[PDB]
Amino acid sequence: RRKFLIDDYLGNYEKALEHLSEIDKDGNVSEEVIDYVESHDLYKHGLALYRYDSEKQNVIYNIYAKHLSSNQMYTDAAVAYEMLGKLKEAMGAYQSAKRWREAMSIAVQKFPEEVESVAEELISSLTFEHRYVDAADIQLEYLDNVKEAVALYCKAYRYDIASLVAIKAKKDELLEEVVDPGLGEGFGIIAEL
Amino acid sequence: LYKHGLALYRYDSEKQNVIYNIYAKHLSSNQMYTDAAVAYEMLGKLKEAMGAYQSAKRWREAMSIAVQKFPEEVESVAEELISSLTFEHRYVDAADIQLEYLDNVKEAVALYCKAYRYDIASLVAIKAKKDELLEEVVDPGLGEGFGIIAELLADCKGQINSQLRRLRELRAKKEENPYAFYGQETEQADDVSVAPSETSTQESFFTRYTGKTGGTAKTGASRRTAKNKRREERKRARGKKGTIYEEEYLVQSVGRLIERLNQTKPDAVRVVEGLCRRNMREQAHQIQKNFVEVLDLLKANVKEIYSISEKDRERVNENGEVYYIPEIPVPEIHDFPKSHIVD
């Protein structure tokens, strides 16, 4: 305790934490340590110190994931929840990271009830992201709409795989429906630019 | 003749069909296959279109017209194209065909192992609706890809360690002799094995040699009896490094290094995240740590890694002038977007 206080007064936060952790030999982590690291944002030393205790290391994983999800960045939160599970939070981090495939795999392997709602959220993201390639992919494979998938194919300037998808639904009308109109629009926009 | 048939017969939609057919035949006879593939289809015959697509790398449209015309051999054509894709190193297309056209997805997972994309690998695995398929086909695949990338990064780590030395000797079989007035000595793809100047690279082929320097061996001052640039002072008491090495050899070695590092960086981070997701944080840490170590080793050395394009002619000086041509003709490294969880 004296060593922790000494390292606090000089501001030596890392020393304070690496000497406070050792006060208790129990497998149950303390709450002073988590309060300190939350107040000072030094979880890096938490995971640089507890490479031994898996359970307490996972506690630090949890708090770090919360911190990263809060402040800026998201795939960190998801890959950290990967150990803790944190199912809904993991899904949220993945879909806020625009990582459709991993989140939807977790959904179909865990939640057979919200499989398409997350697909709706991902298609909204990709339409806002203007990433019509994965938008078309999740539309055809998960939303199961060949017409909309080909529409996104034309949006992303893709026609060859659009022809693939039109063939896949045994629908050659799609060319006269979207593909030929899409190519006409492409000609228009290239002329405009 | 087609030149007399593309001027006066230029706008005869029916005659121009045969004109384009013969032009496509001639262009195929000109060892070209892409424009020939696009030119083989005004008439409306699509078997020739598939035949040209075989050599035109337009797989998808070939399989499409095949299944529209002869859907019985489509699996055979898919296998025939997977053969090339395995040869031509485009494993992702073969994996997509295997998982979509063909029945099995595990072989597509294996081809995913050849491209380092574990997100889609697990996606197409859980497409079979079983989480044990992870440990069945992608977790072993992830371990294998981990081993492959780890060994490749070990090779690159050895490369950066060796190039930091004057003799380039930090591996098992790399060594160069002092005062050898020629010899590029880059007989390996990644400079893993190099023989002395009197044995290595005496052939006329110098892979990844010219595309790293803005100069050549054409000495305008007639020095070295027009030998390869920067071979004058190959002593081991130089005291410093950079443009005093075999400058072309040094920059081509480091250009291969930076190319490997940059190309692996997306794959490297992909594998790092894949290993992190599989509760084996320790190897993700190890891979990222080795990656950051080699990056840090390269960070302080490009400041001296330098070669001069067309001003070196038996130069007595070690580094030549201070800095004449910029750091763009010589190789340069990029930053690394590390994760935050393996630390």
Instruction: Record the tokens describing residue A31, joined without a space.
Output: 């709450």
Question: Resolution of this entry in Å?
Answer: 4.0
> CA dihedral defined by B210, B211, B213, B215, rounded to 10 degrees?
50
| Chain A residues touching B119 at Cβ < 8 A | 99, 101-102
Is the CB of B276 less than 8 angstroms away from the CB of A82?
yes
CA–CA separation, B53 and B33 (whole Å): 8
Distance to chain A for B206, nearest Cα, Å? 39
A–B interface: beta-carbon pairs under 8 A:
54
Distance to chain B for A132, nearest Cα, Å? 17
Alpha carbon of residue A54 to chain centroid: 24
Alpha carbon of residue A16 to chain centroid: 34
CA–CA separation, B268 and A123 (whole Å): 28
**Closest C-alpha among B331, B245, B276, B300 to residue B142:** B276
Distance to chain A for B332, nearest Cα, Å? 29
**Closest C-alpha among A61, A13, A65 to residue A37:** A13
Q: Taking a C-beta distance cutoff of 8 angstroms, is the pair A149, A136 a contact?
A: yes
Instruction: Record the tokens describing residue B286, joined without a space.
Output: 């190890």
| Chain B residues touching A163 at Cβ < 8 A | 60-61, 64
The three-state secondary structure class of A31 is coil
Residue in chain B lying closest to A46 (CA): B343
Contacts of A153 (CB under 8 A, 6+ apart): A132, A136, A159, A161, A162, A165, A182
E-strand stretches of chain B: none
* Phi, psi of B149, rounded to the nearest 5 degrees: -65, -35
> CA dihedral defined by B78, B84, B86, B90, rounded to 10 degrees?
-90
Distance to chain B for A5, nearest Cα, Å? 26
- Give the containing element (helix H, strand E) for A177: none
Alpha helices in B195-246, H assignment, sequence order: none
Is the CB of B273 less than 8 angstroms away from the CB of A75?
yes
| Chain A residues touching B279 at Cβ < 8 A | 82-83
How crowded is residue B115: how many other Cβ atoms within 10 Å of its Cβ? 19
- Give the containing element (helix H, strand E) for A73: none
Distance to chain B for A76, nearest Cα, Å? 7
Instruction: Record the tokens describing residue A121, joined without a space.
Output: 């959220």
CA–CA separation, B109 and B115 (whole Å): 10
Compare CB distances from B341 to A76, A104, A167 and report the shortest one's residue: A76
Distance to chain A for B199, nearest Cα, Å? 50
Question: What value, to the nearest 5°, has the Cα angle with vertex B25 and ends B20 and B30?
Answer: 115
User: What does DSSP assign to residue B235?
Assistant: -
* Phi, psi of A48, rounded to the nearest 5 degrees: -85, -10
The full DSSP string for B302-335 is TTT----SS--SS-SSSS-SS--S-TTTS-----
**Closest C-alpha among A53, A16, A55 to residue A35:** A16
A168–chain B Cβ distance below 8 A for any pair: no
- Token look-up 């056209």 returns B101
CA–CA separation, A178 and A184 (whole Å): 10
How crowded is residue B323: how many other Cβ atoms within 10 Å of its Cβ? 12
CA–CA separation, B204 and A78 (whole Å): 53
| Chain B residues touching A160 at Cβ < 8 A | 58, 60-61
Q: Taking a C-beta distance cutoff of 8 angstroms, is the pair A19, A49 a contact?
A: no
- Give the containing element (helix H, strand E) for B268: helix B247-277
b/e map A26-47, b = 16+ CB within 10 Å: eeebeeebbebbeeeebbebbb
**Closest C-alpha among A144, A149, A111, A105 to residue A127:** A149
| Chain A residues touching B131 at Cβ < 8 A | 109
User: For testing the chain B interface, which of A101, A118, A163, A165 should be mutated: the one with the most B CBs within 10 Å?
Assistant: A101
A83–chain B Cβ distance below 8 A for any pair: yes
Q: Taking a C-beta distance cutoff of 8 angstroms, is the pair A90, B107 a contact?
A: no
Residue A169 to residues A145, A154, A174, B4, B326: CA-CA distances in angstroms? Answer: 9, 17, 9, 45, 56
| Chain B residues touching A79 at Cβ < 8 A | 273, 276-277, 339, 341
Q: Is B193 exposed, middle or buried (0-12, 13-18, 19+ CB in 10 A)?
A: middle
Distance to chain A for B281, nearest Cα, Å? 10
**Closest C-alpha among B298, B157, B318 to residue B236:** B318
**Closest C-alpha among B145, B156, B213 to residue B190:** B156
Is the CB of A82 less than 8 angstroms away from the CB of B279?
yes
Alpha helices in chain A, H assignment, sequence order: 2-9, 13-20, 32-40, 43-49, 54-71, 75-84, 87-96, 100-110, 115-129, 132-138, 146-155, 160-168, 173-174, 180-192
Compare CB distances from B273 to A79, A83, A101 and report the shortest one's residue: A79
Question: What value, to the nearest 5°, has the Cα angle with vertex A32 and ends A26 and A36?
Answer: 130
Instruction: Record the tokens describing residue B280, joined without a space.
Output: 């084996």
Q: Taking a C-beta distance cutoff of 8 angstroms, is the pair B39, B31 a contact?
A: no
Hey, what amino acid is at B5?
G
Q: What angle do the packed helices B118-126 and B106-113 form, to 10 degrees? A: 170
Compare CB distances from A109 to B68, B131, B339 and report the shortest one's residue: B131
CA–CA separation, A153 and A168 (whole Å): 14
Question: Number of C-alpha atoms within 13 angstroms, CB side, residue B91?
Answer: 14
- Token look-up 């706008």 returns B11
The three-state secondary structure class of B194 is strand
Compare CB distances from A105 to B122, B282, B339 and report the shortest one's residue: B122
